[model samples]
Target: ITGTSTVGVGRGVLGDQKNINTTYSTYYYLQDNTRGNGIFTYDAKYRTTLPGSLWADADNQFFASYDAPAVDAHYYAGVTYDYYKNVHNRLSYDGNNAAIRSSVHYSQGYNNAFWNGSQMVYGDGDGQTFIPLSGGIDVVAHELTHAVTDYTAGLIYQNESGAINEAISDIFGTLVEFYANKNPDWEIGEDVYTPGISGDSLRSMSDPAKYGDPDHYSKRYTGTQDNGGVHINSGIINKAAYLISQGGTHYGVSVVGIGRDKLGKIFYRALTQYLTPTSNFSQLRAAAVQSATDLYGSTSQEVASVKQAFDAVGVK
Candidate 1:
């Protein structure tokens, strides 16, 4: 769609009123031109398709129940873009302000969301497990961070590397949640997961074991499910990240809290400059250490806390 940018009104999946950036030619389209090239959102129409169709509106007012998913998908993508640009100084997911795209309602009862190497895909869920995943800011940021990982570290999505990749998404997802300054916590998918169940989430970065994920390296899953426990074993690294940011004692190991900003800075440095495709847990510890040292000096407490956080997670 080629047209001058205009503001549109919409209600997200969570029933929150929001004003979104739209492009107007004949109808208002969910193509936000204010960020990067543009953040384009599409309608999957309960089908399995890539990018589907760019969402359109008659009066530039999105209020139908069907329009809920597209609203959050588009709005949250913009939020994630702002987070990277404002917080990390990165232009976009590719560091070049590439046009970000997302598709919502990707299938009937689709319960998962992913990056798919190109654009972001979201599931509406079965209405029991989830509602619309894009409604969760952390979920949106998590998927977008996968793009960040692909463009930078290029970490292999298998075994330990995959777990690190997953944890990186979780770490930044939580960071973006905090960066947005809305109902933020160290939990993933709390807003869009289990609307029926109260105070529960898809995963907990602060306490990964609350959902049976391993918080220590020795307790890692060795089976072949979830791509060598990419989601399961991410707990180990997630706990390390939590400790690095908020500080905690785990298995008798104590870490001094270095706060969130420093934690993000160190991890961002590692993801962009230190981590590799095949890096593992021990290697991640090394990268974080070097990253902290690079930014905060070798003798700084940030470097010390990085070491202590990894140690607390049994990553030695």
Candidate 2:
């Protein structure tokens, strides 16, 4: 395993070619043994099935244009792993350096990606609505963060807890994008969202209302669709997180910006130490306040900003 890792070059879905870390076993494989059990990439070959085959190349160079989705899936997963390990001192999604696995080209013209309670799966977009889900670092990070939540908070995948789970994914996804410093913004999935559209995204943290999502609890959806409006109501928490980092006034409430790094620190602590499976919005507020206080003292501005942000979003 020591000499298994080798360097490879490939072009991503966006046509940007970059060198990637790979593994060399029986044949040159698209596996990086350097991190965890090694980040492994497989090709579903456009089928509605599980991982098909391990992507193999005669040489370590992966320059095939047709393999763009696999390239980005492998490359972006690596970047996300590095982001957690370097920034939060987390080994991997499981905190124990678990093997990160990914499968690209999942289904024909599929436009979404998800963590199937085991590995990350991506869809090659319909070429109009999206290009390739793995082409977006935020998209990749968002799905992977779901794995992190599963291992730590074990947040249920429905109701208010599900909304918290979704918001946590969006929060860390944006943070990972910023950590990479690649066209970093508070918007989610802007890079691989729509090829024809400009200045749009799958979701927005700065102003969730931009796309008809709630920025306040009063506007939160209480419907049964989308698993209790998990994606929709996540906007409320997303707005609070955005305000805590960037500072803003919402619904006549003002919050002082605490910057991005501190925002990550506080939320990371709450997620790993305080949050539970059935945590509601109000419980999240308490957890975040305690997390901030633990990091910056009870009387610190960080704690005050955390409280103000939740209150601004009507979580209290």
Candidate 3:
């Protein structure tokens, strides 16, 4: 991995070609030294390992089908790094320019991608459920944002706090997707999920209820499964965030859209400044209001929109 950093061309899981940064030692390795400490991608060899072997190619050109997941994983990690540095002014997940590492081809028929507290891991889906987890930029960012959450808020992964943690990842993941300007939409994992099912995603930010996720506090799941329904209950916060960015009426309540930039600033501020490990939905509402107020006075439209968005989602 110690070599001059180089760039390579490759096709992604969706057959879209993109350029990825590589290192030009004897072998071209999937290591980008252009951002932060560096972005390193590895091949899991279809096993459950932490950080597998560093991906290497004889030539800098990667055109084989087997290289698709590694290509996107390496490329998209750079995009997410850029999003935080250029937009949020935060360096890496720790705000200290920590090295970003990822592993692909985790296991056969694996349908999920995740952050293992220290690094990112992607699974090659069973082709029917998904293609490659890294194909979706949002999915990559979503998993990376989990690292951000772990380092910052350290939100407990259970019940309400866990739901908030998931929502924060979704919110920032969606923001990073839009930041990349790659067919942006308020949907999660649409590109990698269900290759045969067009127009379907793992989850919807604009309409979480479409996939049977709670859109309001009244509908919050109280079960013990899924870390107290962390992913399922995240819909309530996700819906509020969607309304804050793109206003709408829900359950007789209305929120005025405040644009995406403001939505991001407020949430980033709240996540880093106010949120705690056990904070619940009501606490989240207070944090958002205070975050908006900190950025744009108490009487500012941003603050009002934050409140309205929570109210619209029945978080009161």
Candidate 4:
């Protein structure tokens, strides 16, 4: 079907009016044929299935209760795609302009979102813990970055490698949030996490320990849960990434700030070129150091900051 660039006016899950890109074909649809098939958002209809029917509207206006999540999911996916293309010079999650697809309102009262190795899936929260998962740009970017990792480093989803995988998602997720410049912070999912609670997030990069996640390697969980504590231990690497960009001292170790752009360059290079399926935290340190060296030379402050950031995290 032929489509035209269309604008959608809708209220998101948090009751905020947002203009989203859509396609006008037979009916106004939640398809943006602008970047990577444009972005396709579907309605899961509160079921635990895959992508549901493509969300359709009658007049390019989406204000229904079920339409809120789709609006944010579709809009944020485009922002994440734009971030990757403009900042890293990458095409899409796969570096080849792969079409981005997302499903919203997955499962009743669910509180999570994931990439599932292909498309993004978001859930409407139980209203107590969360409102809607797609309402958070950081959450959307985080899940989508998992797809990028699948195509690039292929990090196995267990133990140290999996923890690195999770951290990479957090790192890029934060970067994309900043790229969009919407109340950006180092906290993940702060916008849409726990509607009943205030000033809290699913995770924190500035201070991972705020949520009981480890900021130092020694505090990492080595148990055989959460895919070898992938979410728990990612805090160590997240703290390191935070320090590299912002500079900080922890447990007697100090890192000089190298700023966000250089930090992103180093980590993106590491993910794309130096990392492998089974690379551990120590290997990640080496990869990041080498990436910094490649970009700014071995003796540059960027390289020095990379080393210090990892050391501060006790990765050495």
Model 3, 171-272: lDDT tens digits are 999999999999999999999888888999989999999999999898999999999999999999999999999999989888899999989999999999
lDDT of 1: 0.94
Cα lDDT of model 1 by residue, 217-287, tens digit? 89999999988999999999999999998998889988999999999999999999999999999999999
Residue lDDT tens for model 4, 1-316: 3688878799887788988888888898888888865688988888877888888888888888988889889888999999999999999888888889999989989988998877999989898888898999999999999999999999999999999999999999999999999899999999998788899998999999999999999899989999999999999999999999999898888889989999899999999999999999999999999999999998999999889889998998
Q: Model 4, residue 162: what's the lDDT?
A: 99
Clashing pairs in 2: none
Instruction: Itemize residue pairs with steric clashes in candidate 4.
Output: 32-38
lDDT of each: 0.94, 0.91, 0.93, 0.91
TM-score of each: 0.99, 0.97, 0.99, 0.98
Minimal lDDT window, size 10, model 3: 1-10
TM-score of 1: 0.99
lDDT of 3: 0.93
As a TM-score, model 3 comes out at: 0.99
Kindly report which residue pairs in candidate 3 clash with one another.
none
